[PDB]
Symmetry: D2
Subunit: 217 residues, 4 copies
């Protein structure tokens, strides 16, 4: 280890939403063993974005999840080789996103490369209309499957006018090398936008995340 | 009052699974303010179900959910008129179930009436082949919507030969009288089969369930 | 054979939509080898339905599907015993319906028994608001699976304020005796409400439906 | 006009399937008013794809769809500017794919640019195990929505070991310029792999496709 108490990271995203091409670059840092991390983003191409920043927020670091000792830390165990992760986001209004990412380690710094494709968002929807205002804190249900780690979440974006915009997440974590997998468990998360410029071409986020067993066990 | 510290209930279910008709009846009791309840069932018609009992178990009492004082207990508030509940269960292998239920209070006893329709289960699947062995403890994400209370869960049935069989629950709770809805919150639950005969024509269940805010709030 | 060129039928339905119970009875007739049939329904209980009649229309006769000689007529072959049918209807706005049906032959006439459960329809949506106006003609994709016949359709209801309300149908047909199944094929249908009273408590429908191979074959 | 009776095209795709990156480039040609076209592809990077080629085939030209004079040919009318198209493919076993593409016209040659992300495919499934054998002919259901053209299809891949592997397609066609949209209609298609080398690093395809009204209209 390899994975120190303090770790920095670099991230780059190439994405497309309803046909709108964009690129984003950023840097972050956090305490992998404490379950917290922050990140600053900059839209390098296609800005300002014609859609809610919120749909991108969660694609910018699960190696920072705090895990109790009795729960194998698959993501952490994968380094230095690292792991890849994939995801599907099913929006209640038909919107669909598919994400592919690669997580590596270079000279003590984490390297994240992301590809994102979002389609079918209604022109007058909350995404396309920028009517959201952050995510609610969430709880992911994880389990080992097909030799890899999987998890699902029932998430929600807060609507300006009140109410919520529902999104189901389905993620897949795949170590680049064989690593001990955990059993059924949960991960609580809370992602906040801490700052941003008026057109959201510059953004700062904070995330707290921790794994645990269900409370009744 | 109407809802005492100790309350009993009676339940009747009329269902069909893959064309197989059946009837179930039972009696239960519990501590509504403590978050626990038990129930004893008996298959009265269509006896010897040709499918896993597990898919029926969660259809047999949310008025028993322990809620903190700062979270409006919508279901409890609904009495004496009571409430209705509906649900969709999406099985990973294509099976689908819709449930509609009516909850009332009669002579100091909770009265539950359930209709269930399950279709599209593979004949060789874990349901039709009775390969399941109980649910993992779960956590439901609730929120108010359309004037009613809704909630979703990523649940899972343990496989006898190892692994899990996934199911997504979508529930709707509808008070028969206008009462206070809570905001976004969660419900942890754990249902166990405490006793049964080999063919599951006689079963007893126990369930613990409590409402709460997300752990990071 | 038992299936004459002219055949009548009797249907009875017990359903629930968003907690509202209802019952319907009807009588119909048609020419099974020609691909057309009519039916007259009367709401016998729960009358003055508080939702779009159109969601019920398609649950009231596949044995009447015209099949070319080179495509095994599974449903017809199942008689005199008959067959069962189940279905899932997934509505674009979240509403979900499950149906289970039993088709038999008695007194020289077909006997239909249907059970319907509909949930999660938004209070302000086209179904509960009664804003639909008939289905567009459709095309079902069928194939043999798990020893039975299955088919799916991408359906659509026309709306009063223009546009369409999309629904995906997934049906399963199950013979009560082993009969020959066909391979991959298509069924074309067009259902029309031919008459109805002011409150839709008495309704008359017409349906044309025919099986065939893809046109490029 | 801009669109002549015979037209060639250039296509290129960047994709990722279950974390495996690849690139493909190719050229095709056909008769846009006749609904016939062919294409030849070469895997340029990510050599020897570790998954079924079949999943990519339908991503390689709807301007070639034959339309009757009474049905607006939205895609054709969008030129010379062109149009973009997006798509979601939902695999029966959990795999999900999103696609985004751009179609333009350059000096008499159509230019196609495709981005593809596929995730959640079971390692032991027909895709990653290459057990598929081409698509069945299909029929897409189209309708105008949100100022654009949408269509859905219930498709199927033939399994080597027999049977079919089901896939639901959801496509969105967006003209770069708001040209005339058609109303509800269908498109029949039949895609065949005409030639291919052992490892699917060189492949040629043929597609027949024509738009039309429902047969009962």
């Amino acid at each position: 280890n390899v994975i120190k108490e303090f770790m920095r990271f670099k991230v780059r995203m190439e994405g497309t939403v309803n046909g709108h091409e964009f690129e984003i670059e950023g840097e972050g840092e956090g305490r992998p063993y404490e379950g917290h991390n922050t990140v600053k983003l900059k839209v390098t191409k296609g800005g300002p974005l014609p859609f809610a920043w919120d749909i991108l927020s969660p694609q910018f670091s699960k190696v920072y999840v705090k895990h109790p000792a009795d729960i194998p830390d698959y993501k952490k165990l994968s380094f230095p080789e690292g792991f890849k992760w994939e995801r599907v986001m099913n929006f209640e209004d038909g919107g669909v996103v598919t994400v592919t990412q690669d997580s590596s380690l270079q000279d003590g710094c984490f390297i994240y490369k992301v590809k994102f494709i979002g389609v079918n968002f209604p022109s007058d929807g909350p995404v396309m209309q920028k009517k959201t205002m952050g995510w609610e804190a969430s709880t992911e249900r994880l389990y080992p499957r097909d030799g890899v780690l999987k998890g699902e979440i029932h998430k929600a974006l807060k609507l300006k006018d009140g109410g919520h915009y529902l999104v189901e997440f389905k993620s897949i974590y795949m170590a680049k090398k064989p690593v001990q997998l955990p059993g059924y468990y949960y991960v609580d998360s809370k992602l906040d936008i801490t700052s941003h410029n008026e057109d959201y071409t510059i953004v700062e986020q904070y995330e707290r995340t921790e794994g645990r067993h269900h409370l009744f066990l």
